Amino acid sequence: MGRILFLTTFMSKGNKVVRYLESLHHEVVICQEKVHAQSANLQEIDWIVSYAYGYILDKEIVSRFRGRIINLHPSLLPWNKGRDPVFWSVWDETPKGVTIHLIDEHVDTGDILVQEEIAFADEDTLLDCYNKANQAIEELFIREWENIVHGRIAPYRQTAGGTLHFKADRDFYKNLNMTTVRELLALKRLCAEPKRGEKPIDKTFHQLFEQQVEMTPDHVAVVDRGQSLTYKQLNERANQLAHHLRGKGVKPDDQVAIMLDKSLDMIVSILAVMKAGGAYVPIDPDYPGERIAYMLADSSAAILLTNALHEEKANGACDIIDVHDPDSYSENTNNLPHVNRPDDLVYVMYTSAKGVMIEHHNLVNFCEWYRPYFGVTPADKALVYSSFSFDGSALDIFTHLLAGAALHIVPSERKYDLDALNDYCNQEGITISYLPTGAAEQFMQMDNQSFRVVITGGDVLKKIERNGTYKLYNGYGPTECTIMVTMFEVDKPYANIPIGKPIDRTRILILDEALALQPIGVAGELFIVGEGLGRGYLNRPELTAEKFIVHPQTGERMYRTGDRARFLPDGNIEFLGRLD
Ligand SMILES: Nc1nc(=O)c2c([nH]1)NC[C@@H](CNc1ccc(C(=O)N[C@@H](CCC(=O)O)C(=O)O)cc1)N2C=O
Numbered sequence: 001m002g003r004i005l006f007l008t009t010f011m012s013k014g015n016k017v018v019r020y021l022e023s024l025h026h027e028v029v030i031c032q033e034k035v036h037a038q039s040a041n042l043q044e045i046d047w048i049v050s051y052a053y054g055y056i057l058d059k060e061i062v063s064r065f066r067g068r069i070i071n072l073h074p075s076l077l078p079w080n081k082g083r084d085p086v087f088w089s090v091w092d093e094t095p096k097g098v099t100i101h102l103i104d105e106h107v108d109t110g111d112i113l114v115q116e117e118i119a120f121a122d123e124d125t126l127l128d129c130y131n132k133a134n135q136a137i138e139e140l141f142i143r144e145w146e147n148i149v150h151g152r153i154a155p156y157r158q159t160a161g162g163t164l165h166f167k168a169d170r171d172f173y174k175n176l177n178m179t180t181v182r183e184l185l186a187l188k189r190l191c192a193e194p195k196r197g198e199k200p201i202d203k204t205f206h207q208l209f210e211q212q213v214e215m216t217p218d219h220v221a222v223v224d225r226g227q228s229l230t231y232k233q234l235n236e237r238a239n240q241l242a243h244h245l246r247g248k249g250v251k252p253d254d255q256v257a258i259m260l261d262k263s264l265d266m267i268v269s270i271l272a273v274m275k276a277g278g279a280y281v282p283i284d285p286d287y288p289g290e291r292i293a294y295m296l297a298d299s300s301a302a303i304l305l306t307n308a309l310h311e312e313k314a315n316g317a318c319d320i321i322d323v324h325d326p327d328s329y330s331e332n333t334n335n336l337p338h339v340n341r342p343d344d345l346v347y348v349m350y351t352s353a354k355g356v357m358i359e360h361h362n363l364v365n366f367c368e369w370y371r372p373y374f375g376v377t378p379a380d381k382a383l384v385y386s387s388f389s390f391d392g393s394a395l396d397i398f399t400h401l402l403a404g405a406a407l408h409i410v411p412s413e414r415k416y417d418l419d420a421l422n423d424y425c426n427q428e429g430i431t432i433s434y435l436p437t438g439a440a441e442q443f444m445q446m447d448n449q450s451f452r453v454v455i456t457g458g459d460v461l462k463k464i465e466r467n468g469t470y471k472l473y474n475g476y477g478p479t480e481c482t483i484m485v486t487m488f489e490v491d492k493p494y495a496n497i498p499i500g501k502p503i504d505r506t507r508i509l510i511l512d513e514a515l516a517l518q519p520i521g522v523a524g525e526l527f528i529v530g531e532g533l534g535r536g537y538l539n540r541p542e543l544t545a546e547k548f549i550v551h552p553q554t555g556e557r558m559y560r561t562g563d564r565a566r567f568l569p570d571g572n573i574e575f576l577g578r579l580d
């Protein structure tokens with residue numbers, strides 16, 4: 001009878017479709033390569049049927065075979081045109097079906113002949129779906145072929161719109177072929193790009209702090225032994241120092257070093273640096289004079305806020321401002337005119353070394369997530385415990401100041417004696433704070449009735465047994481992505497205590513060495529994306545590039561931690577040590 005040219009690159013030479021056509025006494029030429037007009041595969045052809053053909057047809061060919069080129073495409077067009085349609089059908093959660101349509105000059109733009117709705121069960125694998133569709137369309141072709149040959153079907157134009165996908169759009173998703181529909185949608189919900197409608201962060205920390213001063217001005221801000229400052233008192237003194245600093249020429253993105261012990265003067269100095277416009281570099285003065293000398297050299301800091309006592313540990317490296325000299329304080333107590341943007345530096349901290357750069361928007365995002373998460377109110381009282389050279393300090397000070405809470409400085413007297421500290425808290429009625437895993441585990445041993453919440457993380461947490469009523473939370477995150485990026489409420493004991501779910505405006509991805517996504521439950525190198533990412537390492541652009549990358553598929557900016565982890569079925573993340 002008639003000679004049929006069958007085009008495919010993926011499909012077998014013995015498809016149900018080919019056998020049916022041969023059953024009807026058609027000679028079926030099978031071709032899997034691109035062809036041109038001169039091709040001997042185009043001699044004496046009545047119908048062209050194409051099924052997963054991986055090449056376009058020159059206009060020359062489609063015109064000569066107009067009205068006689070059929071394509072088998074397993075999607076409910078115009079949904080899911082182009083490559084890997086069955087997959088994108090699941091991922092993009094489009095309607096699912098199979099379509100036989102004429103071949104137009106453009107990809108999958110030909111008028112429809114027949115169309116069928118298909119269904120996938122939550123339990124089917126993505127390879128199950130791929131087959132179930134090819135099954136459905138092959139059977140459909142056999143049912144309606146006769147109707148197609150005799151030309152008795154009225155082609156109808158495809159509905160406007162649709163989705164289109166390209167060959168390489170699945171690269172990022174190569175490891176997901178054997179995933180379940182349920183398991184695949186779960187992964188999307190955990191790792192898919194942010195939903196539309198969100199706006200950049202438009203505030204700096206000292207903006208929001210000055211905001212909070214006017215709401216709770218007479219509330220206690222910071223306490224150190226018997227001395228205390230209200231938000232109003234604290235704000236005005238920082239302003240006086242900030243005026244002085246901006247007079248000395250502090251400007252946005254400038255570095256100002258602070259070398260002091262935990263004290264009211266420290267909080268004033270920190271806020272004064274921000275309000276002036278710059279970012280503060282905390283230097284614990286117990287560091288070896290070697291480290292201190294380096295931190296001041298690497299840092300471009302021209303100003304140093306410090307004591308008469310620690311003055312000499314800098315060896316005249318820079319201009320010094322005595323926080324105890326009343327001449328370092330201006331008469332003006334007004335808030336300074338704002339000159340900062342959220343992309344300006346807020347602080348620079350050193351890892352165990354390199355200068356990590358953090359911007360205001362990084363810090364704002366963390367505090368704005370912290371307040372509502374832990375339901376912090378001005379009734380709360382928190383401790384300044386961590387060294388002021390670690391990002392754990394930023395949590396202690398900043399989160400609670402924007403909640404109107406009261407900060408209590410922790411002297412070395414009870415820094416180590418947790419029995420004595422606990423007595424502090426029970427007397428003063430402390431309700432919340434962060435303790436590193438080491439210190440936190442110890443504190444579980446002391447009796448406590450003050451706390452409402454305690455937070456840990458930084459090293460692996462292994463014990464949960466606590467005496468007090470308070471809830472307990474384990475967190476995770478590197479200094480490079482601003483304090484912590486994930487948070488878990490500990491409800492029951494675990495052999496591996498999970499580190500929780502991501503915070504506001506942050507996303508975490510588990511990737512192959514190839515940087516491809518990994519199914520829920522499969523380990524990989526944990527990657528961070530979102531508001532938390534800092535500016536990088538100071539004076540270390542080549543190394544910054546190493547750790548702050550532009551993903552090859554998505555083009556998003558991500559931080560490579562070098563930690564192993566995996567997602568649990570309920571959405572929480574599980575730490576699995578370093579990558580080695
Ligand atoms: N002329 C024509 N119209 C069609 O509608 C049609 C055909 N040919 N041939 C088979 C199928 C389309 N199949 C495909 C699938 C992918 C590519 C492809 O190579 N896409 C590249 C684009 C890059 C480039 O243009 O070089 C990609 O990266 O996604 C081509 C044809 N098809 C009807 O079903």
Ligand SMILES: CC(C)[C@H](N)C(=O)O
Binds near residue numbers: 476477478482483484
């Ligand atoms: C100390 C902790 C809050 C910090 N994210 C770290 O791991 O260094």
